[PDB]
Homo-oligomer: A and B are copies of this chain.
Amino acid sequence: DIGRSSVRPYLEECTRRFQEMFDRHVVTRPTKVELTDAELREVIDDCNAAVAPLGKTVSDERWISYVGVVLWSQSPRHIKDMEAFKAVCVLNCVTFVWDDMDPALHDFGLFLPQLRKICEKYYGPEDAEVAYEAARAFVTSDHMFRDSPIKAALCTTSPEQYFRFRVTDIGVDFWMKMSYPIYRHPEFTEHAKTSLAARMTTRGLTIVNDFYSYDREVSLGQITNCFRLCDVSDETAFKEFFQARLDDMIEDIECIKAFDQLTQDVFLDLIYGNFVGTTS
């Protein structure tokens, strides 16, 4: 049953309603950042360099698909450091190539040094330690938690426990901690470093992500998906659950608007830009 269930019947309407929510609560539309050809060149090279020692080649095309969500989910209004921006591009793609691999191919001895190399190139000395630590902590978490009892408990107990897990596991804390040098904005730097930035954005990112990867994830027996907490085959149960998650997103967005303007801009562009890049 559960591996054969599907949110396909709700695809069009839920997509419609995500967009309607965003239109009514965020209003500002996401924009894609512009990478010059040199910029796009350096990124893919740094990506291949970091993944070579692991015995993996991946196509320019696969890279570009991965970079595209970063381009959508950042906030081009406020970019001030494009080296930081390039770092975030590379570290996102390499860590998601590392995630689509087999776990037996996961040689941390080969990998963490490449992650550290990337951070050292693009970041100042202090910022590079923050980004590297968040990357290290992210990939170690994933290694610790596969087939783990903790993961089963947090992902099956309640939305609260689940989203608590995903603050790290979906990589949003990692995202904020490598992204703040892009904006060099003091308040945003602090919210990223206290992880309040991650805590405010986790549900909007996760609920969108979970919905569009449900069918692939439950067929592969993944359990990190908030929609396994409801019976998606019961339309009345699903729609009620989906409405609850939509209220979660609204409350967070309405709370995000108490932050300073620039931080707010970055938080909402991430959430709504991720929705757009996920459906492109």
Contact = CB atoms under 8 A, between A and B. Distances in A.
Interface stretch (A34-42, A82-90, A96-104, A194-202): A194-202
A255 B157 contact: yes
A72 to B, nearest CB: 26
A165 B196 CA distance: 7
A149 B259 CA distance: 7
Contacts of A254: 157
Given A137-B193, A154-B258, 10 more contacts: A133-B193, A140-B190, A141-B194, A144-B187, A150-B258, A158-B251, A161-B251, A164-B199, A165-B196, A168-B196
A246 interface: no
Contact-residue size bin, chain A (C-beta under 8 Å from the other chain): 20 to 34
12 contacts: A141-B196, A149-B258, A150-B259, A152-B258, A154-B255, A157-B251, A157-B255, A164-B200, A167-B195, A167-B199, A168-B196, A173-B195
A49 interface: no
Interface in A242-271: 251, 254-255, 258-259
Given A144-B187, A251-B157, A258-B149, A164 B194 contact: no
Contact of A195 (B144, B168, B251): B168
A140 B196 CA distance: 13
A195 B193 contact: no
